[PDB]
Design an enzyme around this catalytic site. Structure first.
Site, PDB file in Angstrom:
ATOM      1  N   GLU B 357       0.821  -1.204   0.000  1.00  0.00           N
ATOM      2  CA  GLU B 357       0.000   0.000   0.000  1.00  0.00           C
ATOM      3  C   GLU B 357       0.859   1.259   0.000  1.00  0.00           C
ATOM      4  O   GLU B 357       0.461   2.289  -0.560  1.00  0.00           O
ATOM      5  CB  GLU B 357      -0.956  -0.018   1.189  1.00  0.00           C
ATOM      6  CG  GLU B 357      -1.944  -1.184   1.152  1.00  0.00           C
ATOM      7  CD  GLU B 357      -2.904  -1.132  -0.032  1.00  0.00           C
ATOM      8  OE1 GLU B 357      -3.294  -0.021  -0.453  1.00  0.00           O
ATOM      9  OE2 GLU B 357      -3.267  -2.211  -0.548  1.00  0.00           O
ATOM     10  N   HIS B 487     -15.826  -9.307  -5.750  1.00  0.00           N
ATOM     11  CA  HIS B 487     -15.653  -8.413  -6.891  1.00  0.00           C
ATOM     12  C   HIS B 487     -16.775  -8.572  -7.910  1.00  0.00           C
ATOM     13  O   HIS B 487     -17.000  -7.683  -8.739  1.00  0.00           O
ATOM     14  CB  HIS B 487     -14.292  -8.674  -7.525  1.00  0.00           C
ATOM     15  CG  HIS B 487     -13.147  -8.386  -6.607  1.00  0.00           C
ATOM     16  ND1 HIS B 487     -12.694  -7.108  -6.364  1.00  0.00           N
ATOM     17  CD2 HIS B 487     -12.391  -9.206  -5.840  1.00  0.00           C
ATOM     18  CE1 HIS B 487     -11.690  -7.155  -5.507  1.00  0.00           C
ATOM     19  NE2 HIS B 487     -11.488  -8.416  -5.171  1.00  0.00           N
TER      20      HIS B 487
END
EC number: 3.4.17.23
Lengths: 141, 597
Positions: B357, B487
């Site tokens: 990240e 998703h």
């Protein structure tokens, strides 16, 4: 005195075209004293929002040294007066958007130009004790 | 005066106006992500609707500008992203109906729960509770019950909404003149009119199939080995020539496979690659993890984190009254405000996820000088791939030797080498047939190669054919096990992870090209040489001003996606895979099932 974006601070320097220095505060060549700045992430940046701080980025042509651009008439790409919110008649003054939670370059800087002029009057703004029985030089006031 | 000067004028007005409004929208998103309270979600939908309506209402001024008058590409790709309406262009009824059914699925998948057959009180959600027991339990009935109950309670609720989803979503695709919603996924890489740097849409299907044919033998040997070790750890369940039961693959659907490692460790008498206990031994917190990751970013040549990152982001798990979601996500806000939402534990996976990240946020700080809707990647895949670069280079023992963990005489026998290779290969390989199959399957459903009452059949049969995965109990047409994944239920395509896994080893070869790497691709650490950081930086900041082909040429010297870097990464391991399973069968049979016998 003016409060800017950090990207505008290098736009307050001799040379240094920029975008903000085209229409708002034009920078001279020689007539240039000091540029002092410090950060107001506490005063001129509030974490929830304070938008008294706007800038102008549309005007028919650039400026001249130390020109004060105040008057608020909306901009058109071929004049011929608008009727807002008609299209291609933009607001010139848009908000800063600098809050306390922002980074480094996007905390608004207090910038002051000390504009120096040489001897169009006697000098105005500028910046020991005695010894007895000794042959000295003087200078009083 | 001309069309392009007022196009630049409206676009820079759009920059200086959209900066603040997207900043308010993502401030509201950040207040939700650090504080889940209903006041935060009533904050979260005001400015977000004032962003989605902003793109549409300024698209009504952007579509008045004729797009095919501009010779340039820099402001033309700007005008393209505004003249895309988004998802607001249908009939008034079906637009709000599809967006409402998407919100309904986003609720019922994310808050639904399962309950004990003899006890309607023992009731828990998907994460945690199921997925950790779906990773570590040795009980067949427990993992099977969790696996089936999660698909029966909410997947049966997600099937009719998927039935309406496909029709209204392909109707949006037709209203924006696309082929299917599969063509909406093929039109994310849609660069046009550069003539040497272009890309067509069905060429995505072309590339996926043609470079997955190089995945199929490696995955075949790897599937054989993990079938051997699953017959080891779960005896008398699996056929020696068959596929794998869907509740043994480490997770719920068979996507991530690293949780097989404790049952697929090759050589367990050799020192562990998991440095989690070493991170326990020095009593680390999240703070030293992120700061040492940032020092790795300095050593590869990427700058420090600014003041807003450490003054504003959440980096631990609260637990108390201010409770919140803790999924590690990178946040572009603009205004120098680039954040990571991450509740970190003391874990090697959380260490690499901190690298991941912060690689995303370093990428964001690189393209922070772009125009505002080009303050995004060149495409969807470079973000996730650049994020995975720092974790893949950091996971090598050449970096674990350099952290301060793993006292600096670490051996180089081939043993822990092959163990590290197989442990990474479980994830890296086994995500790709599920990606291939999931994306190609939804391409078939949206395209219409599958009738609307053969979804669940072709789903599990292509899990058998491609991923080598069997469901243990049969599903009727009330289920929708794809829609009971994240998703599919929450509007994200999945081929971005495929492109991630290809550009990952492409950027691995490219960043080891400059730092004078000596060994094969597996031991390569990009640390302590900043020329690789410069070579990555001259794609890290371009954004959607230039296509992925031009930047991808400037990185690896190729223009089509290639997985031969992954194959040369896994090739000594591939010889080891051919070496071990000579007493096994390499492959899988799609007629075997735990319910077919």
């Amino acid at each position: 005195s003016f409060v800017v974006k950090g990207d505008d601070v290098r736009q307050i320097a001799p040379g240094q075209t920029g975008v903000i220095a085209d229409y708002n505060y034009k920078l001279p060549d020689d007539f240039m004293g000091c540029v002092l700045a410090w950060n107001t992430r506490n005063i001129d940046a509030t974490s929830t929002g304070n938008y008294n701080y706007k800038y102008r980025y549309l005007r028919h042509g650039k400026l001249r040294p130390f020109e004060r651009d105040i008057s608020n008439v909306p901009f058109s790409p071929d004049g011929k007066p608008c009727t807002p919110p008609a299209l291609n008649c933009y607001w010139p003054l848009n908000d800063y958007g600098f809050y306390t939670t922002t980074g480094i370059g996007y905390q608004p800087y207090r910038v002051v130009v000390l504009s120096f002029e040489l001897l169009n009057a006697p000098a105005t703004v500028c910046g020991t004790d005695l010894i007895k029985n000794q042959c000295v030089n003087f200078n009083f006031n | 005066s001309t069309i392009e000067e007022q196009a630049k004028t409206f676009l820079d007005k759009f920059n200086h106006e959209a900066e603040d409004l997207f900043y308010q929208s993502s401030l509201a998103s950040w207040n939700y992500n650090t504080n889940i309270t209903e006041e935060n979600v009533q904050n979260m939908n005001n400015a977000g609707d004032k962003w989605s309506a902003f793109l549409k209402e300024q698209s009504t001024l952007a579509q008045m500008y004729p797009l095919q008058e501009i010779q340039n590409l820099t402001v033309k790709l700007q005008l393209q992203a505004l003249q895309q309406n988004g998802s607001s262009v249908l009939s008034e009824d079906k637009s709000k109906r599809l967006n409402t059914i998407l919100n309904t699925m986003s609720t019922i998948y994310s808050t639904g729960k399962v309950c004990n057959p003899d006890n309607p009180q023992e009731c828990l959600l998907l994460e945690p509770g199921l997925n950790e027991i779906m990773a570590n339990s040795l009980d067949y009935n427990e993992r099977l019950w969790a696996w089936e109950s999660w698909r029966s309670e909410v997947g049966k609720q997600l099937r009719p909404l998927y039935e309406e989803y496909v029709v209204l979503k392909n109707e949006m695709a037709r209203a924006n003149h696309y082929e299917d919603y599969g063509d909406y996924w093929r039109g994310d890489y849609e660069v046009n009119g550069v003539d040497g740097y272009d890309y067509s849409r069905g060429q995505l299907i072309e590339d996926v199939e043609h470079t997955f044919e190089e995945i199929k033998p490696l995955y075949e040997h790897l599937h054989a080995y993990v079938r051997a070790k699953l017959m080891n750890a779960y005896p008398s369940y699996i056929s020696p020539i068959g596929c794998l039961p869907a509740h043994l693959l480490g997770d719920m659907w068979g996507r991530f496979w690293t949780n097989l490692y404790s049952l697929t460790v090759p050589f367990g008498q050799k020192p562990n690659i998991d440095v989690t206990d070493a991170m326990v031994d020095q009593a680390w917190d999240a703070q030293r993890i992120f700061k040492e990751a940032e020092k790795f970013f300095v050593s590869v040549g990427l700058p420090n984190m600014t003041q807003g990152f450490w003054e504003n982001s959440m980096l631990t798990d609260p637990g108390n009254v201010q409770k919140a979601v803790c999924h590690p996500t990178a946040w572009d806000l603009g205004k120098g405000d680039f954040r990571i939402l991450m509740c970190t534990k003391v874990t090697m996976d959380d260490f690499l996820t901190a690298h991941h990240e912060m690689g995303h946020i370093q990428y964001d700080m690189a393209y922070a000088a772009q125009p505002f809707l080009l303050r995004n990647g060149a495409n969807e895949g470079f973000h996730e791939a650049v994020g995975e670069i720092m974790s893949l280079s950091a996971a090598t023992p050449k970096h674990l030797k350099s952290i301060g963990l793993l006292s600096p005489d670490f051996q180089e026998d081939n043993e822990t080498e092959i163990n590290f290779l197989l442990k990474q290969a479980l994830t890296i390989v086994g995500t790709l047939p599920f990606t291939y199959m999931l994306e190609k399957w939804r391409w078939m459903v949206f395209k219409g190669e599958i009738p609307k009452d053969q979804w669940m059949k072709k789903w599990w049969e292509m899990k058998r054919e491609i991923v080598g995965v069997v469901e243990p109990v049969p599903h009727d047409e009330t289920y929708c096990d794809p829609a009971s994944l994240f998703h599919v239920s929450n509007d994200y395509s999945f081929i971005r992870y495929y492109t991630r896994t290809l550009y990952q080893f492409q950027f691995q070869e490219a960043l080891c090209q400059a730092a004078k790497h000596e060994g094969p691709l597996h031991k390569c650490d990009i640390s302590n040489s900043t020329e690789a950081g410069q070579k990555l930086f001259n794609m890290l900041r371009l954004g959607k001003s230039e296509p992925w082909t031009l930047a991808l040429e400037n990185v690896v010297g190729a223009k089509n996606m290639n997985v031969r870097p992954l194959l040369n990464y896994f090739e000594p391991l591939f010889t080891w895979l051919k070496d071990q399973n000579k007493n096994s069968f390499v492959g899988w049979s799609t007629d075997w099932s735990p319910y077919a016998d």
